[PDB]
Every structure is written in C-alpha cells, then in structure tokens.
Amino acid sequence: MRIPLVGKDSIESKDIGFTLIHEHLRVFSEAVRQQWPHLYNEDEEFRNAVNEVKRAMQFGVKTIVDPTVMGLGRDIRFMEKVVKATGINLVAGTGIYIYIDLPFYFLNRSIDEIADLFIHDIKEGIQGTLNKAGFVKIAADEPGITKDVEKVIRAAAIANKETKVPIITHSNAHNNTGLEQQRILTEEGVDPGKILIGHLGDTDNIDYIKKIADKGSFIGLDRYGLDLFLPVDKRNETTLRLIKDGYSDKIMISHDYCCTIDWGTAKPEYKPKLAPRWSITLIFEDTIPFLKRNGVNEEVIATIFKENPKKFFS
Amino acid sequence: MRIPLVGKDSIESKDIGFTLIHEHLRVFSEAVRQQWPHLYNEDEEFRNAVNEVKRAMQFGVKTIVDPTVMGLGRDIRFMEKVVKATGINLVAGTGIYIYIDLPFYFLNRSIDEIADLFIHDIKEGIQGTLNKAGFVKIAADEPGITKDVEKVIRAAAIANKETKVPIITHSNAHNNTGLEQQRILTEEGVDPGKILIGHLGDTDNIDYIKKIADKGSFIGLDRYGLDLFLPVDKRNETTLRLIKDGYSDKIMISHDYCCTIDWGTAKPEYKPKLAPRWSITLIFEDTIPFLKRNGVNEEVIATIFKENPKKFFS
Ligand SMILES: CCCCCCCCCC(=O)N[C@H]1CCSC1=O
Ligand SMILES: CCCCCCCCCC(=O)N[C@H]1CCSC1=O
Ligand SMILES: [Co+2]
Ligand SMILES: [Co+2]
Ligand SMILES: [Fe+2]
Ligand SMILES: [Fe+2]
C-alpha cells in the first residue's frame, strides 16, 4: 500500500498515526566524511538517534519522516539499524539538497536524468537496497533559485507526476524561495496539496506564510527549538494566530532536529547560545500545552499531526 | 625519504625518474556515488586504470602524480589496487577541489581547521590508511577567487609551510586565477618554486604564461589531448616557443587524463568530438616527436619530465 517504510512492509496513509513530518537521525557532508573519516564516530551517532526516537515514541509519535537526502549524507543502512533497534515507522526520501550548484557529475545532464535518479529510489530502491523512497526533498536558500536549484525542482515535479509521492522543501523564510518553489512545481503539474513548503516558521511575516497556504500547499512551521532563526515564543504566537485565522488545514509542525550534525554552526558549545531547548520532543513539552491553554481544541492537534500528514501522503 | 608513495615505501626526490605530474586514475562526485551506486562499475574503472598505466610504463614513465582530492572522489584503496596490478610509483595528495563554495561541514570553521585536515593526510595518512600525501591540491575556475576558494588556498599555504610539500593548482587560463593563486600563496610565505600553476596550457597568451614563470613557479602545460580547451597543434607551438625563449627550467607537461570520469560533459562518446587523441601517452606520440623534429634535444626533455619534478619535490 502507498507508503514505503524503512525496514518494514509498507502501510496505508490512514495508518500513519501521530507524525513528525521533518526530523533528521543524522546529517553529514558526503565528500568530507569520505575523505576524512577520522572526524566521525558511528557509535555515538547511533546512540543519539536511538535515544531520541525512543523518547519520541514515549510521547506517542508513531511515524517520523526523515528528509536526509543527497548533500545531507543519506544512509539507508544506518536507518535500518535505527528502525530494528526502536521499531519506529520511518519514511525515507530521495532528492538533492543544494544552495547553488550541483556536483560536477551533473555537468551537462538533463532534468530527465536527474528525475530518473529519484524515480529509481522510489520504484526500485535506495543505495542498492530494497527500501523505497516515500517522497522527494528539494532545497533553496539565500542564493535564491539558481539555474541548478531550478533543474532539481522541475526534476522533483517529474518524479511526483510519475509516482504520486509528495514533495518536501527547504526554503529561506525571508526570500520568497518557498513561493517560487511552489510556483514552479504547480506550473509543472504538481498538485499544491502534495507540497510541503519548509521553514516558514522562521519568520513572523504572516502575510507571506498565508500566501503559500492560500495557494494550496502545506506550511512548514518546522524548526521548533532553533532560536537563532526564530525564538520558540514568537513561533508559538505565529502558530496560534494562524490557527485562529483558520489555517490548521495547512499547518505542519516539527523540530528539524538532527541527533548528530557535522556543520560548523552546530556543536555544543553553541547550543546554549543558539538552540537551548532543541530536541525531538519539544512540542510536547512546550508548544502543545501552550496551545491547549490558549483556546485550541483537541481536534486541531489531530488535524496538524494526523490528518495533515495522512492527506499529504494520499 | 622525502616523497611518499601509494602502496610503497617512500623515495628520495632524485629517484623519481620520468614523471607525469598530472594524471587521474579515476574521478567521481562523492555525493553522487554514495547515494546512487547503480551508476558506477568498479571492475570497468579498475580495468581502464590498469591498462592506461601499463602503456605509460612501457613508454618509460616511472612516476605518476595523481591530483584527485576532495570533490574529485579520491580513493586511496582503489589507488592501492592499481599500484599492486602495475608496480607504478604513484604520488597521492590532499586538498580541496571547489569552484564556488565549500561543503556545509565548513560553515564557520577556521582556515586552520582546514589546514589540519591537509596536515593529517600528509603526516598521519589517508582515509584510515598508512599511505601519505606528498602535495596539496587546490582549485579556482570561472567564478574567480571566491571567499571559500581563498580559504582553501590560504590553508594550502599553512600545510606547505608546516610540511614542506609542494602545491599543485587548477586554474582557468583566461581568468587571472593562476596569477592570483600564486600571489596569495607567495604573500603567505610560500616559496614560488613549490607551486605548480595548472592549466596554463589552455591558452595562447605567452605573455600571461611567462608572467607566472618570471615569478618563480612551474607553469602547467598539462591538458594535452583536450582539444576543446586548446588543440594539440596550438599547444605544440606555445610549448616550442616557450622552450626557445629559455623557459624549460619552469615548464611541466602532462595530459590531465581521466581513465574514468563521471562528469556529463565528459561522456565517452563525446571523445571523438571534443578530445579525439586524449590518452596517458599522447606526448610520447605527438608532442615529444614534434619538439625533437624542431631542434630541442634529449636533455631538454629530461629537464621537463625528470629534473623539474625532482626540483618540485625537493
Ligand atoms: C547548537 C545547534 C546550532 C544551531 C543549528 C544551526 C544549523 C542550522 C539548522 C540546520 O541544522 N539545518 C540543516 C540541519 C538539518 S538539514 C538542514 O537544513
Ligand atoms: C571525454 C570528452 C572530452 C571532455 C573532457 C571533460 C572535461 C575536461 C577534462 C576534465 O574534466 N578535467 C577535470 C577532471 C579532473 S580536474 C578537471 O578539472
Ligand atoms: Co532544511
Ligand atoms: Co584541474
Ligand atoms: Fe531539515
Ligand atoms: Fe586534473
């Protein structure tokens, strides 16, 4: 049935349960890990991913969706190991994560060649395995929609038309990259309701966030805990106002938490400064209680974390 | 022993023999191969590499230096297997190959943090292995000297001043990037004679080439066979002109041959169109016979292929 799971038989979308739509078990740069393996510890990385997932399950999370793709160090065999040790429903994805240019391989290669790579992961399997991709992940940031960023977007559209898997995105909340990701995809024939425009929760500008929701796509209020982008209390208030204005239809919430990440911006000793409370269960400790005592019905919590993910994969 | 070798004990610079200063056994994008291994055949890659090196050895090549680094899919273990199968002297290196930006790993990481990686490869070994790097490889192309490109160059300088190993560069002949690479490296305290400014053979402009030579660095006439950058005959007239003008003390010659390469611009089928005669032995078949016909004797060939690489690694 039409949702593939890492190390498990597939399930129907109605069986997804409580879902976290955007969480990384591990992130690394493929090129630097390949060249300098001494910078990494797989024992620590497995210990962290298992600990976080187990705690996620304790709070009632049934399914985690992980958009670690090319550029972010996707590893399906690490993901199987985490599944076997926890029992979680894990949805793996395909795609390319870039800000400016594609890797040299892609020099003079068509959009169709790029789409064939995604369709491979969806139909055949990931990294010589039999685990399939459940979605396509794309990215854009400060540099905007560059020539290569766009090729990858249109390639994601071809994958969706051909397989009916949904599309998750990375955008900079301060550009209109999300508005442009949505525009290109829908022009290519992708159903707006099959798109999650990510990182809209990094901004207060509710006029911009509603513009994407008004066009039919889900909105990623998905970086809860990352105070360097936007503090938790401004996020909570943006979330509350959107619900009050009648947008729980399109709202999806997550942490974008990485149990381990190799970026120089990450580490401990920056966590107290930049993201003090950032973990995989923060919405349970803060966001959900906050909303409950500010007039938000239990029905709304069900829409955001159950009905919206189910629809997204339907 | 000064110079370290793959799969072999190190040698003195004087026993280097006839050398090809810039050739690739295999090049691939690291992120692409890790995520989509169905695109690659290793048996075919090994076979292509062994056969090329065998022809070079028959023609008298004792040593090959391979500037494949991060971004080009360096693989010390694949390099080991080729050494075993032929018996060639192979000099591996360290460094970073980028045109625009560094991998996400390097976000807010110091130039010294980059230098430490190069130094680890030179002093400790490559990829969990006891084989050591004998030079540092850096790059710049059309986008010019970006802030990440400049960072890698300045890091190469630290590795050279700390380990004494020479620096090989990739440049765009039409940009001034080679002259800028030399300027930045010398301003940092690098001996001009420990620098090879690459891909200067891609241009007619003898004034630009001589400029770099006058400042004390080796000049890279190193892409023989790649007619799309500059055809063999126009390369021959520039090489001959430079030798006649007295510049053989600074000339280095190679082909930049890739036994396999995953770049889409380099599909083996564009070969007859873009680089028909390109192989690891073109200079034995065309260039050297051309120079000999034109009056340059055997001792001048010995300077370029034996004495200059010796100086470089001394
Ligand atoms: C102490 C933690 C530092 C704050 C994290 C800053 C890094 C930016 C957020 C971030 O981690 N973005 C990456 C990670 C997952 S995929 C992706 O897009
Ligand atoms: C086979 C058809 C001819 C096109 C050659 C492909 C592009 C030029 C050769 C080439 O791509 N060299 C690259 C690879 C190593 S370093 C570098 O900058
Ligand atoms: Co993101
Ligand atoms: Co090059
Ligand atoms: Fe993410
Ligand atoms: Fe090269």
B41 in contact with A at a CB cutoff of 8 Å?
Answer: no
Packing angle, helices B111-123 and B147-163, rounded to 10: 40
- Answer whether B22 contacts ligand 2 (Cβ < 6 A): no
B72 vs B67: CA distance, rounded Å: 9
CATH of B1-314, one of 3.20.20.140, 3.90.45.10, 3.40.50.150, 3.50.50.60: 3.20.20.140
Binary contact (B264, A108; C-beta < 8 A)? yes
Which resolution, in Å, applies to this structure? 2.0
Q: Are A20 and A252 in contact, with CB atoms under 8 Å apart?
A: no
Which amino acid belongs to residue A179? L
Binary contact (B105, A70; C-beta < 8 A)? no
Contacting residues for B88 by C-beta, under 8 A, at least 6 apart? B53, B56, B57, B61, B63, B64, B82
What is the nearest CA distance from A191 to chain B, expressed in angstroms?
27
Place of tokens 């010796």: B310
What is the nearest CA distance from A229 to chain B, expressed in angstroms?
16
The bound ligand whose nearest atom lies closest to the alpha carbon of B229 is 2
Residues with a CB atom less than 6 Å from ligand 1: A 24, 27, 72, 170, 226, 228, 256, 258, 261, 263, 265-266, 270-271, 274-275
Binary contact (A71, B265; C-beta < 8 A)? no
What's the CA-to-centroid distance between A266 and ligand 1, angstroms?
A: 6
- Answer whether B206 contacts ligand 2 (Cβ < 6 A): no
**Of A38, A104, A127, Cβ closest to residue B37:** A127
B100 in contact with A at a CB cutoff of 8 Å?
Answer: yes
| Atom from ligand 1 closest to the CA of residue A228 | 4
Residue boundaries of the structural domains of chain A = 1-314
B265 in contact with A at a CB cutoff of 8 Å?
Answer: yes
**Of A37, A101, A263, Cβ closest to residue B104:** A263
Contacting residues for B261 by C-beta, under 8 A, at least 6 apart? B24, B26, B27, B28
Reading across the β-sheet that carries A94-95, which strands appear in turn? A94-95, A136-139, A167-170, A195-197, A218-221, A251-253
What is the nearest CA distance from B70 to chain A, expressed in angstroms?
6
Q: Which of A12, A8, A5, A24 is nearest to A310 (CA)?
A: A12
| Atom from ligand 2 closest to the CA of residue B141 | 18
Question: What's the N-to-C CA distance of chain B in angstroms?
Answer: 10
A68 vs A82: CA distance, rounded Å: 14
Binary contact (A29, B107; C-beta < 8 A)? no
What are the phi and psi torsion angles at B227 (to 5°)?
Answer: -65, -20
What does the H/E/C string look like for chain B?
A: CCEEECCEEEECHHHCCCEECCCECCECCHHHHHHCHHHCCHHHHHHHHHHHHHHHHHCCCCEEEECCCECCCCCHHHHHHHHHHHCCEEEECEEECCCCCCCHHHCCCCHHHHHHHHHHHHHCCCCCCCCCCCCEEEECCCCCCCHHHHHHHHHHHHHHHHHCCCEEEECCCCCCHHHHHHHHHHHCCCCHHHEEECCHHHCCCHHHHHHHHHCCCEEEECCCCCCCCCCHHHHHHHHHHHHHCCCCCCEEECCCCECCECCHHHCCCCHHHHCCCCCCCHHHHHHHHHHHHCCCCHHHHHHHHHHHHHHHCC
Long-range (24+ apart) CB contacts under 8 A made by B203-208 are B203/B173, B203/B174, B203/B230, B203/B238, B204/B230, B204/B234, B204/B238, B205/B173, B206/B238, B206/B241, B206/B242, B206/B245, B208/B173, B208/B179
Binary contact (A28, B127; C-beta < 8 A)? no
Burial B159-197 (b: 16+ CB within 10 A, else e): bbeebebbbbbbbbbeebbbbbbbebbbeeebebebbbb
Long-range (24+ apart) CB contacts under 8 A made by B299-307 are B300/B243, B300/B248, B303/B248, B303/B249, B303/B251, B304/B248, B304/B251, B304/B252, B304/B253, B305/B18, B305/B19, B305/B20, B305/B253, B306/B16, B306/B17, B306/B18, B306/B19
Residue B18 Ramachandran class (φ > 0 left, ψ -120 to 50 alpha, else beta): beta
Structure tokens at B20: 């090809």
Q: What approach was used to elucidate this structure?
A: X-ray
A125 vs A120: CA distance, rounded Å: 6
